[PDB]
């Protein structure tokens, strides 16, 4: 192991990402990309310039779990190959912001039952599973949450460390 993970998480910022379907998290895991609505895009871009690591912690709505976490490797950008997200009903791709490149740190899941002792001061000290898409997670809560995930032995944090 956990030592390189702790190094990556040192003074990181953390954001809760809520997806309405597994297809979008699967696409993000395969392609190393994420896109969000402009209100969250602006916050993530500010954070990316502001901290050594910005960590996105993903949860599919109604799943009762987190599906993993990843680190921003870029600010948002436009003009690339279109990602075929499964968009919510009535949503258009034009409504989205740009695309963030992300490096996955853990692709394993964590059930909410394992994070019940962690509350987020920035969301009224509600359990950290609770929050709108884009809710920032306070440093200590987010660090402890990420350390709860099962180790993902497929990932080598050496290359992510060099991006810091």
UniProtKB/Swiss-Prot annotation:
Residues with Phosphoserine modification: 81, 92
Annotated consequence of substituting residue 104 to D: Does not affect ability to influence alternative splice site selection
Effect ascribed to mutating residue 18 to L: Does not affect ability to influence alternative splice site selection
Modified how: Tyrosine phosphorylated.
Record annotation: effect of changing residue 24 to D: Abolished binding to N6-methyladenosine (m6A)-containing RNAs
Binding residues annotated for RNA, in chain numbering: 18-20, 34-35, 85, 133
Effect of residue 66 to D: Abolishes RNA-binding and ability to influence alternative splice site selection
Disulfide bridge positions per record: none
Compartments where found: Nucleus; Nucleus speckle
Domain observations: The YTH domain mediates RNA-binding.
The protein's role, per its UniProt record: Regulator of alternative splicing that specifically recognizes and binds N6-methyladenosine (m6A)-containing RNAs. M6A is a modification present at internal sites of mRNAs and some non-coding RNAs and plays a role in the efficiency of mRNA splicing, processing and stability. Acts as a key regulator of exon-inclusion or exon-skipping during alternative splicing via interaction with mRNA splicing factors SRSF3 and SRSF10.
The protein, known as: YTH domain-containing protein 1
Gene name as annotated: YTHDC1
Shown residues within the full chain: 345 to 507 of 727
């Amino acid at each position: 192991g956990t030592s390189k993970l702790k190094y990556v998480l040192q003074d990181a910022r953390f954001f809760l990402i809520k997806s309405n379907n597994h297809e979008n998290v699967s696409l993000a895991k395969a392609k190393g990309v994420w896109s969000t609505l402009p209100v969250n895009e602006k916050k993530l871009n500010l954070a990316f310039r502001s901290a050594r690591s910005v960590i996105l912690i993903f949860s599919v709505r109604e799943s009762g779990k987190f599906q993993g976490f990843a680190r921003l490797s870029s600010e948002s950008h436009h003009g690339g190959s279109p990602i075929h997200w499964v968009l919510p009903a009535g949503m258009s791709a034009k409504m989205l912001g740009g695309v963030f490149k992300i490096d996955w740190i853990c692709r394993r899941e964590l059930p909410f039952t394992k994070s019940a002792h962690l509350t987020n001061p920035w969301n009224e000290h509600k359990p950290v599973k609770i929050g709108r898409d884009g809710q920032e997670i306070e440093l200590e809560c987010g660090t402890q949450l990420c350390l709860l995930f099962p180790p993902d032995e497929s990932i080598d944090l050496y290359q992510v460390i060099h991006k810091m």
